[PDB]
């Protein structure tokens with residue numbers, strides 16, 4: 001239906017962040033959003049389905065803010081743009097929050113854990129890997145597996161940032177981001193360019 | 196010495212149960228059976244107590260990590276270090292500590308950075324010393340040792356910490372050697388003389 005749905009999502013996100021997923025009840029969500037349990041369960045048949053809707057919405061959205069790298073832009077420039085958008089999504093979006101909420105469930109909801117992984121981090125690997133296939137086909141990178149190589153690129157460029165963010169110590173200027181990206185990219189190319 | 200270690204353990208218990216902010220020096224003194232006089236004589240503040248806990252726990256986690264010896268062979272040294280490094284992630288040895296700090300939501304930055312510098316950055320510095328020996332022996336090339344140590348650890352760690360924290364990792368010994376070999380292969384393609 002209508003406007004109470006998006007009020008329900010926002011009310012639920014707030015409670016999941018402050019209290020965790022299992023600690024938040026559909027009862028509390030209904031109260032916070034000012035709907036009957038009838039209206040709430042008509043939109044989302046369970047708490048699990050609600051969190052699933054939230055994961056898929058945020059991950060589909062983060063995926064749209066990511067360029068599709070074109071080799072016509074230059075190899076270095078393509079990878080530098082992708083890296084830059086990838087780190088911006090980390091800093092300015094809910095990935096770390098999602099992981100904190102699921103990690104706090106101590107393995108109770110594996111189906112939600114996998115849904116987040118496959119909609120987000122694995123989706124980002126697959127998008128980069130498609131582009132790394134194009135670049136290997138153009139004989140300008142060499143590697144055995146594109147998914148393996150996409151994971152390596154993202155690991156290099158990401159470094160320890162997710163831990164710094166979770167500890168409240170990531171406070172890195174745009175200039176500091178370009179340095180992280182340049183170092184990861186330099187190293188990826190040292191390993192994958194024909195030599 | 197005498198009292199201190201009972202106070203440390205009593206405080207660790209309360210920090211885990213209740214969190215750092217929620218725990219009072221009053222409760223720590225009660226739990227350890229000392230006067231507030233005795234407690235404040237050993238420790239200036241709650242912040243100082245947590246600091247002693249971080250330094251002790253990080254020095255201890257650091258002792259479960261080899262010192263890589265170049266005399267053992269480059270690949271073998273790195274493979275042993277990588278293996279012991281990933282064992283820390285798999286047995287969730289940092290997890291409780293990090294949950295306590297992360298739950299303070301950036302209210303205690305000096306404690307957060309002391310944990311970072313005493314633990315994860317300490318691991319980078321140990322590896323960087325070893326990569327300097329290897330560069331001096333002309334069997335790796337790279338511009339900055341700490342940059343290179345961070346890259347090695349990033350490659351070998353990959354996605355594993357995320358899979359573990361989400362409860363989607365259960366790794367056989369054979370799967371760990373494959374993670375290490377892939378990271379090591381890549382690191383050497385980039386740093387070996389060509």
Ligand SMILES: O=C1C[C@H](c2ccc(O)cc2)Oc2cc(O)cc(O)c21
Pocket residue numbers: 095096099121159160161162163315353354355356357
């Ligand atoms: O793959 C990683 C690495 C990171 C991490 C890095 C260093 C460390 O010491 C602990 C954790 O944890 C994560 C947390 C995330 O939200 C997303 C991620 O992709 C990761």
